[PDB]
Symmetry: D2
Subunit: 461 residues, 4 copies
């Protein structure tokens, strides 16, 4: 093809069609302004054409997937095998050979579409866990390409990874890249150890740095670079948006509609068993039972975005969370005044920002999360320096946001102590923490992340 920079991701960067706002596709804009750029992905509709679509800024290459393809490659292998395994088997992975076979077939199709788009010697950046076979497949089709891969979810310890019957194929798949990146040094180090243990490759032994001190894996005549690049957001843009009059007005209206509580706790997540929503609710219930939170002036809002309804584990999770909600309100609410407000629906971005602005305590308590950008978004929104972030240690974000109230979500006693502390912090202490968190997040944005990864990738040439 005629593109010298190519992104490969499970989905095209569109909404159903118009270009989706923000995200990676926006972070890359000033590179696409000087490159012949392409994006390979599934357009989100079954059995579409694979005819290229010019976006002026980008050229989009659609990948044809049937509904059955999506069921077995995506909702099957990706979300019911890889997702739970990589997130510390919070639920039991399902090992299914037909899912594997479709995952291979679909990965090859992405590889073919990439080659079609990629000019000679082009730079290719493959995204995330659905496409781990693509780098090797692409190198075999197109040895002229420079190939980067970034994993957005955690890379699990070897003891868990080894469960995968296709462990070697996945590892070889990733080793097809010139650069393999993870959010955290821990993931990079697991990958190095896996390369030694499973594949028998020679690797570097030193600790892996942050955006520096890269590891290496020797594969025959070529070297694979391994690095840690923690993703972030467009901090400045969110900071700006959150100051808008209409957002501030909505935040005040939210508090009014909640009956003007003294304190609002907020959870914002896709409904996933990795997110520790159940832990927040358990902690809140026990605090109310113990009289350590005031049921008359404190309210918890949980906004759950529907996710993966076709996967049974998610339906069961929804059932447990919805039981907790009903239970806590039945026990501690009053007619016309719940202590927990729970919504299971998509939420417009501007409404979410208004909730960040209204919330006195942000509860981000995943059991395991690659990064978690909701924590960083809350921080970027609080230019008033109000609020408080309660953050699980088991997120990538916890490595950068040390000034937050950090918790081990498995330590329920300390989660409860911490929620009380966040709710009752002095104004000055709250400001001190938020000021420090904002300094970090404003300085370490998605632009820094993307430039760091691409600089590392370019250096493999």
């Amino acid at each position: 093809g005629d593109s010298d920079f190519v992104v490969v991701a499970n989905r095209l960067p569109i909404d159903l069609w118009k270009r989706s706002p923000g995200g990676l596709v926006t972070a890359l804009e000033p590179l696409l302004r000087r490159r012949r750029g392409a994006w390979i992905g599934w357009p989100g509709i079954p059995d579409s054409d694979e005819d290229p679509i010019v976006d002026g800024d980008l050229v989009l290459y659609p990948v044809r997937l049937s509904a059955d393809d999506v069921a077995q490659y995506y909702e099957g292998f990706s979300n019911a095998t890889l997702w739970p395994l990589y997130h510390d088997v919070i639920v039991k992975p399902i090992y299914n050979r037909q899912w594997w076979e479709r995952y291979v077939e679909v990965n090859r199709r992405f590889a073919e579409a990439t080659s079609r788009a990629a000019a000679r010697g082009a730079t290719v950046w493959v995204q995330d866990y659905q496409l781990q076979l693509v780098p090797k497949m692409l190198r075999e089709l197109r040895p002229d390409l420079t190939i980067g891969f970034f994993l957005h979810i955690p890379f699990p310890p070897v003891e868990l990874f080894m469960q995968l019957p296709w462990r070697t194929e996945i590892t070889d798949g990733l080793l097809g890249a010139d650069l393999v990146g993870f959010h955290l040094p821990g993931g990079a180090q697991n990958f190095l150890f896996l390369a030694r243990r499973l594949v028998g490759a020679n690797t570097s032994r030193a600790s892996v740095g942050v955006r520096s001190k890269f590891g290496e894996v020797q594969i025959g005549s070529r070297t694979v670079k391994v690095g840690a690049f923690p993703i972030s957001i467009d901090s400045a843009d969110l900071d700006r948006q959150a100051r808008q009059r209409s957002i501030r007005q909505r935040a005040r209206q939210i508090r009014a509609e909640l009956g003007n509580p003294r304190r609002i706790l907020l959870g914002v997540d896709r409904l996933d068993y990795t997110k520790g929503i159940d832990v927040r609710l358990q902690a809140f219930a026990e605090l109310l039972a113990e009289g350590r939170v005031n049921r008359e002036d404190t309210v918890f809002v949980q906004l759950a975005t529907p996710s993966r309804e076709r996967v049974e584990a998610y339906r069961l999770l929804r059932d447990d969370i919805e039981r907790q909600v009903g239970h806590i309100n039945g026990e501690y609410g009053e007619v016309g005044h719940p202590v927990v407000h729970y919504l299971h629906r998509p939420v417009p971005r501007e409404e979410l920002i208004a909730f960040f602005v209204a919330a006195d305590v942000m509860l981000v308590t995943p059991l395991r999360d690659g990064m978690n950008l909701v924590a960083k978004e809350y921080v970027a929104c609080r230019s008033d320096l109000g609020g408080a972030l309660v953050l699980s240690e088991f997120t990538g974000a916890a490595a950068e946001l040390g000034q937050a109230y950090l918790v081990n979500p498995h330590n329920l006693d300390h989660v409860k102590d911490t929620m009380v502390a966040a709710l009752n912090q002095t104004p000055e202490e709250g400001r001190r923490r938020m000021r420090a968190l904002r300094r970090q997040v404003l300085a370490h944005d998605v632009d820094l992340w993307a430039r760091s990864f691409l600089d590392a990738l370019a250096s493999t040439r």
Copy 2:
């Protein structure tokens, strides 16, 4: 003893101590004003004395029960064997011989306490399913006594009753009475058939009337009278109470606190699997899904009084209902505005009356209920002629309250159609129904009921 009229019931008519208001004990007041009256029952505290307590109006005879006695006789045999069996095995009865043995032992203890209190030739009125052995035991101890028994819960069909391993002992127990009463002719007729089938007694074959046309069972030289006496409330007293300024003010405040909805649906029940609370919630959810109820101006309040927490079936039921609540609000509510308000706690009587006055639609949808006085209380409160009663056919109340919106709770399509009809009735049609229901309930009160039963019992002399 020195009492010529004696009531026998599982509990003494007290709150923990002071005399409990209303109820049977108040209905009997003008008889106790001309009788030497006694009440036999458990005082609600473990291992108490059995020393008589003069209430001036009554003499109370406490029955000593240990916590283990209560666990096996009451929460065991009474509530986990008899209760589910008599209510059409909505949950599976547990047949446990140790529970049976304690039930016999405790029933004998009540019989002994009764004899202690009862003067020669005294009239005795035994209450309800916990004490079905007492009449026979008492007749053996005291053949001089006139003995009535009234069952407050349904009497099941023979096909289900026969499951009970101690079916014959229970039947003989009831046949010790001079008069056996039920709310409905159906129960009386089941009892007659059971007497023929199981005990081989000669009985009458005709239909049993309401407070008339009594059946009979011949037991050797004596005859057992069998009748239907549908219980009611002190209709006039509730009518009066509901007109009080403070009640009306509270009802307005309730509507204000709910955000001034156009329509309020109300459920008021002890949390029991017989009450069909799950059906109301399912119907409401599907109506919202179908857009047939307006989620912006219609709200459902369910007040569940905690019941029998030590019984596993009740804990599981609570879990399912609380899930439904959380689910429906997550799907159709807004932050600061649920469509379902659910409270799991005891509610003061005056607060309940205020809710009756506020509610546009009363949802009384049991799967099976002896009478259900909540339906009649709602009617007695609506002297403004507003409101609407949606009532399950499977209640004793449905035989008298035919002007209500009657439903088969198993027919979910018709339950949904009926809720829409009740919510959207014309003012005139609503008034027509409520006027007719009030005529019935005001005329057929607890006084009429108690006099009818005691007249029938006296006639056995």
Copy 3:
């Protein structure tokens, strides 16, 4: 059509094709020898033709049903609504309007096929719970016909029947017959009461006799006869078959293959929650635990024929029973010697007869069963007068087989006592019981049953 006697049943009397042996179709042979006979039913294959098939003896009229028809009318309405409801709601019936609508549509199709076959003034005999609408539909199409209906499963008490949202339609459906028959007087009496309560018809009030003393329901100008006709088997034929050399040789071989136990208990059932298989296993386990049965010389064989695998309740039941089997053997067996042998597969008739001949104790312990012919078959096979029948009271068979060891399956203590008694009976006492049971079963066979029903039906002319 040209048939003056017509049977209507869910399935044609064939195996897939050849005529199925025994059963109703064989009982009717000497009537078909003097009649122009027809049989209407589904041939058991989806979307077949409805072209008549001459069997010389009979003419078969196939009813076309699609796989979807079978799923909603048969496995849906018939087996997941009616079956559990009529058997005392051992599992919760599912009320589904789409199932109902298909049940109506399919019943009409059977009615149309019947009319096609039936000559003018012909006699029609409709079979069982799948076809309860056919009599009314047929009378409307063909008022010239004489119509009988026999229900092979129990008819439930009114309190349970009334749950059915289409209760009135089913009742009207049955009332289309000139004769409605049940195995037992109890079913007939429930039907009479239902006719009065639900339909408001005038009925007889007397007890219903066995093959006599019929009840009646007045429907406008015509009368519906109601009777009890307990089904049986071809007793003489089974008695004869069980004496065959090869059967006796197989029975000895069975005992040899079980390691020559002193005592064999046997269960033979379709795998259904009505059959009380779980109760047998629980009783056997507790007897072994208590050392009241000798684990070294006593063995229990349970032969479960697979049934209704597409219905979830049956899959769950299979799971529980299979757990019990594994558990009991793990606890009381030895390697090479289980105490329970369990087979989940169809069993050839001649193999079943050999098991009847080998078994010292026959365990027939349904929670609820219309008749249960397995009990009568065991009796007919034991012309050696050996063996012992343990029989649930909750079967139609218990009304005729009073000399068996009768048990209330809910009374587990007595089930256990009874199994010990049967296992250890003296030879003389065993013979006394078996001799008496055989006198009853040899005299009251399927021929007597069929003649009695047809005589009653003919008398409605």
Copy 4:
């Protein structure tokens, strides 16, 4: 005290009393023959004395534990927190603060008993996961002691270990030792990484060898040695025992009692969710379904020893396995001939050896296991060179027994392929493998293991 060599373990090496045979206590005999030896442990009876008991060979120091102590420290913290966590969270660990507090209290009690027994400068060897706090506690009480600790179960990856709310306390506890040993280099390397990540200690970075190339952790002025020492059995003694006439006679009798099958598969385990018993049964069922194993001449014997009945996860596991057993026999067995024989009971050692000798295929398929000595015992018993070992990769044993048929138990397709391969191996290939496995196991016995650990520990002086 007066002992210069002291073993510390959860239980005293006795049966209830007499000295228990074999095991660690026998491996140490020639050291105790030249040492003043002591053993500290719970005698297995509640609230005993702590008076020392001379065994001539050893002095036993009993630790007093109440039944409540055992419930919270052992069945609670040890078996419901640590056990599932360290075995890759196959079931969800329970984090309970009261269990933790009792675990600390009990560990201190063991430490106090050790100090009481230990002479000045004595060598102390603490055993296993129940006693991980003891080394630090002991060093604080008795800085004069040389302290070794060996973990017999796996040491989990840091991502899982970090869940533990008392992660730091456990790690500090282990760091109190002069030598920390694990079966495998992987465990040692996890420990080193944990020491760096959690405790911030300086450690060695190199790979850890087998009984060599030790790691180190610097703790202030002292160094902690870290090593891998894979445990084994008394190979020669078992080899000798398995040749006994009575054992060989019993093995032949076992095959006779199974109906002389051509092939016997054997599983021998404590009933634990770590052991992968469910996987064996699933594989066997699918092979039978596929006709790849002959149901007429192949039989699977599973001997499950009862374990931890007071822990709910184990009761649920028992239920699932027992269901599988019942199911497979119901589907593929014949009356008098199951395809699966399952026993849930303790088995005498001599009976187990006879089963090893009889078994054609040994199925050792844990999901995760520290070592698994059953695999090595089978090998030591087969001096006839018959048999075949199917072994999970996820055992310590798989690192030494590479000549076995190794399987990933999560790869069910390959487990099935492998069982077929083992069942149908040529005699020569079977012998080749068994000969090689025996060379390893005969050379690497419990004596080599114990000497290696004690040499390493002595070198810390």
